[PDB]
Design an enzyme around this catalytic site. Structure first.
Site, PDB file in Angstrom:
ATOM      1  N   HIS A  91       0.850  -1.204   0.000  1.00  0.00           N
ATOM      2  CA  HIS A  91       0.000   0.000   0.000  1.00  0.00           C
ATOM      3  C   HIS A  91       0.869   1.230   0.000  1.00  0.00           C
ATOM      4  O   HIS A  91       0.454   2.296  -0.429  1.00  0.00           O
ATOM      5  CB  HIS A  91      -0.883   0.043   1.251  1.00  0.00           C
TER       6      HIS A  91
ATOM      7  N   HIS B 288       5.600   6.519   6.883  1.00  0.00           N
ATOM      8  CA  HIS B 288       4.967   6.053   5.631  1.00  0.00           C
ATOM      9  C   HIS B 288       5.042   7.158   4.587  1.00  0.00           C
ATOM     10  O   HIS B 288       4.950   8.332   4.955  1.00  0.00           O
ATOM     11  CB  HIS B 288       3.454   5.808   5.817  1.00  0.00           C
TER      12      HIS B 288
ATOM     13  N   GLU C 281      -1.926  13.605   0.816  1.00  0.00           N
ATOM     14  CA  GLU C 281      -3.264  13.303   1.293  1.00  0.00           C
ATOM     15  C   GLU C 281      -3.883  14.600   1.781  1.00  0.00           C
ATOM     16  O   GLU C 281      -4.993  14.923   1.366  1.00  0.00           O
ATOM     17  CB  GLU C 281      -3.210  12.224   2.360  1.00  0.00           C
TER      18      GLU C 281
ATOM     19  N   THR D 197      -5.004   7.440   7.951  1.00  0.00           N
ATOM     20  CA  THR D 197      -5.538   7.671   6.612  1.00  0.00           C
ATOM     21  C   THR D 197      -5.646   6.369   5.894  1.00  0.00           C
ATOM     22  O   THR D 197      -6.070   6.294   4.744  1.00  0.00           O
ATOM     23  CB  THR D 197      -4.700   8.675   5.819  1.00  0.00           C
TER      24      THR D 197
END
Length: 257
Positions: free
Chosen positions: A61, A91, A103, A195
């Site tokens: 991911h 991340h 994001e 998120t």
């Protein structure tokens, strides 16, 4: 499972994690003309002096760097936070081209990418326990904008080929996360969530106003990872970002004028 494609993407998340439609979901758009400057927001205290990185993984991911959080060696304090928060994971969220990837957005502008230095509240014992609390995490969001090469990202860049596909990981000791920080520690803060699934509303978000710079060659290389496992058709890990969620009656505050 889940992902960012049309069949497992951000739109499907609520079926397995109904909190996806929660009142405190992340990321959000930071509207500069409405965010509220708070003169009593203390300065961020980043103490990464004895930080102990462990490994880098391509979880399928995004890639992530995991740290040893057995003790107070790389903590976040100050700002809107009470107590100490240990760094456990870094991340990266990236786009397919310069105009998108982050994001959180600022006045609707999407940065080329976003880093999430995930820290958890020591009064909770551990990460798993902390994600269950509304104030269990403090996530430092750092935007990336194309510019000069960032020494700190270069460390990650050099290892990307060892983690091309999902499930691959590599030793990543002696990584100094201070190299991922911009000059200014000014930020925006608001209550939100993870998120990515489980999307638990447990985070005090601290999104740094100043983006760190990344060269063209570095972003090019960050878009070369794969979402897929080795031996499956190549699906580049690009645009692995959840879009902005409803702010509801939430207030984003700024630590700066």
């Amino acid at each position: 499972h889940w992902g960012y494609g049309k069949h497992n993407g951000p739109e499907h998340w609520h079926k397995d994690f109904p909190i996806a439609k929660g009142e405190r979901q992340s990321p959000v758009d930071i509207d500069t003309h409405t965010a509220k400057y708070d003169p009593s927001l203390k300065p961020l205290s980043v103490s990464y002096d004895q930080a102990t990185s462990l490994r880098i993984l391509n979880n399928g991911h995004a890639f992530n760097v995991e740290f040893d959080d057995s003790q107070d060696k790389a903590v976040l304090k100050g700002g809107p936070l009470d107590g100490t928060y240990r760094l456990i994971q870094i991340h990266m969220h990236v786009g397919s081209l310069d105009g998108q990837g982050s994001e959180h957005t600022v006045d609707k502008k999407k940065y080329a990418a976003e880093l999430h230095l995930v820290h958890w509240n020591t009064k909770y014992g551990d990460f798993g326990k902390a994600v269950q609390q509304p104030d269990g995490l403090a996530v430092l969001g750092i935007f990336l904008k194309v510019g000069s090469a960032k020494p700190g990202l270069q460390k990650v860049v050099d290892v990307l080929d060892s983690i091309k596909t999902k499930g691959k990981s590599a030793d990543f000791t002696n990584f100094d996360p201070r190299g991922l920080l911009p000059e200014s520690l000014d930020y925006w803060t608001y209550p939100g969530s993870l998120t990515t699934p489980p999307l638990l509303e447990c985070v005090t978000w601290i999104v740094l106003k100043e983006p760190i710079s990344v060269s063209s060659e570095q972003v090019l290389k960050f878009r070369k990872l794969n979402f897929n496992g080795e031996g499956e058709p190549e699906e580049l890990m690009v645009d692995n970002w959840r879009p902005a969620q409803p702010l509801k009656n939430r207030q984003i505050k700024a630590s700066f004028k």
